[PDB]
Symmetry: C3
Subunit: 244 residues, 3 copies
Amino acid sequence: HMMADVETRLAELEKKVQQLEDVNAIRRLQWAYGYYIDYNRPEEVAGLFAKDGVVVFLSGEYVGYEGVMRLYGTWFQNRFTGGRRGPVHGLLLDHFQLQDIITVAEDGQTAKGRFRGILAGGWHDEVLHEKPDEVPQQFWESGLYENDYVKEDGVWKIKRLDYMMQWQGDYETGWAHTVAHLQPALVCYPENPDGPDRILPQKDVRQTWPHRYEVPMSFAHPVLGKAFMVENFTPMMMKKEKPA
Amino acid sequence: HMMADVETRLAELEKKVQQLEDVNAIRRLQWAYGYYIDYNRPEEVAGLFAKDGVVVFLSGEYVGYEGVMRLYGTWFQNRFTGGRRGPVHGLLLDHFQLQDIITVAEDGQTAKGRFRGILAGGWHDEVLHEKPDEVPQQFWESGLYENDYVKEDGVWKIKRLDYMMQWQGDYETGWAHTVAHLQPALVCYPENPDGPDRILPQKDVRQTWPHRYEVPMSFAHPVLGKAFMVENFTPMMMKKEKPA
Amino acid sequence: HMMADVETRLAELEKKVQQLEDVNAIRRLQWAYGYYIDYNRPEEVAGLFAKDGVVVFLSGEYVGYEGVMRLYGTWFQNRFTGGRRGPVHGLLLDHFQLQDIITVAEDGQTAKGRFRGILAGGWHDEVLHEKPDEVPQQFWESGLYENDYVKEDGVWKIKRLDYMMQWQGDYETGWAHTVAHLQPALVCYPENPDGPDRILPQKDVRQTWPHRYEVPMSFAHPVLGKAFMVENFTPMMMKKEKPA
Ligand SMILES: COc1cc([C@@H](O)[C@@H](CO)c2ccc(O)c(OC)c2)ccc1O
Ligand SMILES: COc1cc([C@@H](O)[C@@H](CO)c2ccc(O)c(OC)c2)ccc1O
Ligand SMILES: COc1cc([C@@H](O)[C@@H](CO)c2ccc(O)c(OC)c2)ccc1O
């Protein structure tokens, strides 16, 4: 009667409040991830992952704690700090994280999120001698994430972090005059000590800047949903003979 | 009795949970908008608008789907990609979106939001020949939004997107040595194929960088509210004879 | 019976909804703060603080309204606009704010938040003659915040704003070739008209870029919590003889 109504209203509020909390907790993961990677702290990063978690970098999959520690630790921390937990003198690696769009599964057990970063990177002249030869002294970089999350034992965890670098620009010359200094993975671990456990299938492998490939949205069109159709709107614009 | 109390508490929670969901849904619109414009996808952008929606760009109003497709499509997509859905080889148009302050109307049917973007734009040397003559090869740009939202048939939609560009900086020279390459609208559609349906009244027309004009906050002072008065605090500072 | 269950469920929802609202209100403070400082509006900034609030800048504490007005007003507004409420012609001071991680106390009366800013700053050539001698014409800057919040009379307020600048880069040369043009505080107010009420204890004083110091996280590890231990993961990486 009145009590069936109260039960339905409570249950509905509990579900909605759960989803609002889930969104905050998933965003917190990605923002926390950012603050750890800025400090070259691979251990904190590995801890954010499910034990069967994966990170994807330059079309290569790194599997579990060991894989995450090999990417952020063996490769990145040696490259940027010589194997020190940061921050350290004269080394900038600020990955400004923003623009989260999170989609929680209806059952509350998994989620997707799109996010992005803009990286200001580099070695100050006082520590330039620590920089490896292949890398610009200072550069901008941007990338897109399309991540998967899993809820295990009440806790949101990274199930798949897929970082798809979009562009780099040497500070001095900019994105217009820079070719990426990173290329898609070619050699797996353990032949390549910095290498992935596996390379994505070729159809999924991405060439780097100035090459561009769409990263599909994990979110539906937020107004028209699955009913959105491109061809319903294209006829309203004019394609011109050349750019103006 | 006890049941009047339960009813009041449920109703109060339903209202607060509705407002929390409304804030997430309005932010999602603006973040989604960003990801679409970065890809030169005008169709997805037009779909975010109410059918009587308006976009304001350089002091010009573009009305409805047709107007939004003329701005993002006829003008922007031709300018940046030659009329291709992006992303495309060597063309960067990353509008990093952040700093949302959303104010939902008490009745839950409309809202305002302030947001901002920083744009990293440009043509890689490999596609520089596609760039129109008026536009720098690579540039930074920032702008402020003060938008209106409407809830129709249960869905948050853009009612007014008002993008007020604040500065541009050629990559090579920076904001200090750059004058905006865009000026306030002068000619409406259809005389100007890229033009607005109408130009704002003169009092509201904005000159561009290095000219600056306040964009009033859509939010009340979040601590003192309408009781905030500038003159209560100014006397505590010292104005100096010159900048130090 | 059924009514004890309904009471427990309501109370639990009221607590969770309160915390979700608290997070939005604390983020709103920091985003609002950003929009005010971009406009050189020290009065709005002072109003966000508790009356016993503190702002920390270059290892100096500025106490209460008077202190906040001396920093943002006496020092910053004179430096950037000659003592005018902004925005003004040719003066850019955009502090892009992002990456909030807020932790509300269990009792709902206090909170911590980590945030960050990237500042695009400078004088256009048309107003370069207004720039003080010590300051670059145009520069990037980034900083970290670890702030404290208090809830007083139902309203979230800034209890401690601790801005820890991390790097500056002259636009023309970048962070790699720039030394900070600001140094830790040396002289208190009123001997130094721009000075803090007190200088932090020496152990807490920070040298500026290219010097780097950790800013500890105010948040627990969001997956493993206090159980997180660095030494559980370090053995999985290889430290190399030199950076690669
Ligand atoms: C996988 O997670 C991320 C990875 C990146 C990298 O593309 C950055 C890492 O700083 C990188 C840039 C230049 C380099 O030479 C480099 O060497 C190995 C790595 C960025 C953000 C991420 O979330
Ligand atoms: C209306 O919505 C937006 C518009 C802008 C434009 O100011 C950008 C669009 O990329 C622009 C910059 C340089 C150009 O030459 C140009 O040519 C027409 C357009 C930015 C963000 C928005 O949300
Ligand atoms: C305390 O709050 C903030 C302070 C800063 C400053 O480091 C900026 C302020 O614009 C600054 C940069 C160059 C200067 O020469 C300068 O002169 C005094 C100040 C930045 C963000 C904040 O939240």
